[PDB]
Design a protein around this ligand. Sequence first.
Ligand SMILES: COCC(CCO[C@H]1CC[C@@]2(C)C(=CC[C@H]3[C@@H]4C[C@@H]5O[C@]6(CC[C@@H](C)CO6)[C@@H](C)[C@@H]5[C@@]4(C)CC[C@@H]32)C1)COC
Ligand SMILES: COCC(CCO[C@H]1CC[C@@]2(C)C(=CC[C@H]3[C@@H]4C[C@@H]5O[C@]6(CC[C@@H](C)CO6)[C@@H](C)[C@@H]5[C@@]4(C)CC[C@@H]32)C1)COC
Lengths: 88, 651, 111
Amino acid sequence: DMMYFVIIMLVVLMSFGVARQAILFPNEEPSWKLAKNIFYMPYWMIYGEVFCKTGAWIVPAIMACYLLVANILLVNLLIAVFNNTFFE
Amino acid sequence: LKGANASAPDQLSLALAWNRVDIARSQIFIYGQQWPVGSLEQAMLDALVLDRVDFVKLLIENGVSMHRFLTISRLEELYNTRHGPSNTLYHLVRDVKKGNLPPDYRISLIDIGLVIEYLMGGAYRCNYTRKRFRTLYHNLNHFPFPFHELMVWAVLMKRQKMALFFWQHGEEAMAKALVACKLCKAMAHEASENDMVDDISQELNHNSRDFGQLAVELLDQSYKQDEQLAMKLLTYELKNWSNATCLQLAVAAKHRDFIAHTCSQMLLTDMWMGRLRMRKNSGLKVILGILLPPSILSLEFKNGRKIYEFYNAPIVKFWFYTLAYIGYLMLFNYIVLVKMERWPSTQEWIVISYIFTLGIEKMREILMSGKLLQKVKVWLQEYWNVTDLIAILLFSVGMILRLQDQPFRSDGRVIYCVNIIYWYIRLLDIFGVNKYLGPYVMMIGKMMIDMMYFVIIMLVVLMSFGVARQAILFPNEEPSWKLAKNIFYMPYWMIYGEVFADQIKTGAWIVPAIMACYLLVANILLVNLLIAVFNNTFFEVKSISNQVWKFQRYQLIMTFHERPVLPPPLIIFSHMTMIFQHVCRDYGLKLFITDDELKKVHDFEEQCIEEYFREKDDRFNSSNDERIRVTSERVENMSMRLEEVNEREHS
Amino acid sequence: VKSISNQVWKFQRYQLIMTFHERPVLPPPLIIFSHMTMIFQHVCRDYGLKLFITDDELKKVHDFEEQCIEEYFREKDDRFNSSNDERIRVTSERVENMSMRLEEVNEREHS
Ligand SMILES: COCC(CCO[C@H]1CC[C@@]2(C)C(=CC[C@H]3[C@@H]4C[C@@H]5O[C@]6(CC[C@@H](C)CO6)[C@@H](C)[C@@H]5[C@@]4(C)CC[C@@H]32)C1)COC
Ligand SMILES: COCC(CCO[C@H]1CC[C@@]2(C)C(=CC[C@H]3[C@@H]4C[C@@H]5O[C@]6(CC[C@@H](C)CO6)[C@@H](C)[C@@H]5[C@@]4(C)CC[C@@H]32)C1)COC
């Protein structure tokens, strides 16, 4: 069950990370550094480490939605699943 | 009876009017009654219209045969009767005929056929409205299956006991059960619409539930007795019920418990695998065969042509679509992560072509689904289609905006970055095919509501605290939109662990106190209450999600059976094949059988229903309540008899 | 706790309805007008609380209630007399009485 919820969390996290990195940095030459910025910060920012370009104001809004979905909707569901599949 | 000294039909009519069946069973039907010719059928006709189940059964048991009794004229007289309980057949006839009928209008079988075709659905075509029957009815017999018409008559006129009696006699029991369930449900909806007395709208649902339960029990008995014949019974074309399988009738009736049964799941899996025999390990070998055409011939096919037979299996089409979608997603990520040129790159053109092909395929699908406005309403009934339309339109406006001046180019790139989130999220629909990822996605969808109902209160408290703190700390702010940002921002980041005691004047010391109260309320009470709510509303939600997923397997299988072989990115070739052919379901939907197999299946179903009824009666007569009641009655009777015996004194 | 909360909310619906039925039409920000027009009328529930009825309808309602209570008592008695415990007890008593009577019958010997 941990693995399944990890799969879903990875999908959502990659979506948010790619969207934010694409919005903020528009002039990046193709390099392997791009493949690291889409996973690193969105993964560290769900464990309590929370912190002009055109349309830069959408980043805090999508960040709020991402935190409210990943840190609330899925974690509590995982808790419920662990709770109700325990006796057997 | 013996005082009248009249003929047997007169005594029988008296007993029929009194609704006393045992008197007729004992006194009337005796050794050599010498019934006049035509008397028994007249008594059967009289007993039908008065709703006497016991007398109809008794007359059937003593020589009356429905195959000779029932004609077109007698059925017509049955449909126009008045000496019975209330029914809503006349209102349905009026609605179908749009109220043009004169008062005391004489109903005809064509009107009943129109009512049935209106009630069943869209593709239904009743046997009454076909050309052959209309020709035979204009120039004026026999009914090959009388019990079908008798059961339909009993269901439409709302006589439940007669319907249950006619259900167990004759062939095609499951088809009759499913059709009756659908008709009762549709009539309940129609009566609830036109402001009826509202007892009808809660008795017709009871009738529908009874018929659905009977169909499920009969399917369970058939599957227990034999699996291959049960699966063959669920697929053969029903000639008498507008050319549909039992599965399609179950799906149109929205009967979730019938599809969720194990037999239906095995049949749908065997449809999903197509012509391939592989059952122990699929998926990885399917994509192996997709990538390696030499690996295709090393597989096993059920009884040159192997490649064409392989590409038409639904599972191979599904995996091809999944691989194409994953490739498109990778190209989308690549074109949004790197710098954008003045003119689009090759991968951007691939993405645009894929989106255009998907859009035109969706519009072709909505254009092949009669009246234009009705297909739109049916196709917009799903949230996925609406989201696809919104995403495609937004992507089109981005494409229009992207090929313009530099600020418009930046705005188009931003709209692409925003739009990629939906195409990343939509992988959950692909995951719904998996046996475990479907129910969890449905469960998340159901828990969204409980999440929102606490998001509301969290917003209320958060806005209160933010306004209080911002008003205390900053007293000389000119009215600007910056004020509307400090209300929500910091108090929202402070509940996710980003609490800054350093970043928090007259009365400035109240800010830490209200901050402590706000943290203790928001991050302790509401969160744990939400956890408790999610915990205690989980079992029913997961069972419902499992049932709904098992029901939607059929729709997914049919959707990928209708799908063309090529994936959307290169669907252009087959999108112009039907254009030239316009001016120019052997299995996976039905299963055509011959006459001998049809007769064998009918006898099998009859044996199953007889066995099921016998088992039910045997189970009922051996339960504790029945034994206790019968023992009490016999003990009381014996006590009275023994009191009578001891009362006498010959001494 | 949730069952108790549901019950209490369903109970308090009535008080909320009566509270908003009594209140004046105007909202508090502009209630000053109805707060001074009521002063002048001092020296000058057709439905929503009750329902005044006629006499014939009153007779009909009384007969309906009497039929309902009679039916309810008859149904309760019929349900009670068919339960398993009652049948077991009555059967045991009748079997014991019958056994005593049959012992008396077989006790006599006219042979
Ligand atoms: C510094 O100079 C180096 C240069 C070499 C340039 O290499 C580039 C080649 C393309 C490559 C590997 C680069 C950056 C982002 C890479 C993408 C990250 C995305 O993330 C994924 C992963 C998860 C998916 C679900 C979504 O997308 C990939 C498919 C996507 C990806 C792997 C597609 C290919 C991209 C680097 C040499 O010059 C000759
Ligand atoms: C820099 O110069 C700009 C100036 C324009 C001045 O615009 C001001 C107009 C009033 C406005 C929009 C401003 C600041 C706070 C705004 C409030 C935030 C509050 O938050 C809410 C939201 C949630 C509610 C439940 C509580 O209050 C709003 C109702 C409340 C609000 C929208 C009421 C109106 C206020 C900006 C131009 O000079 C001509």
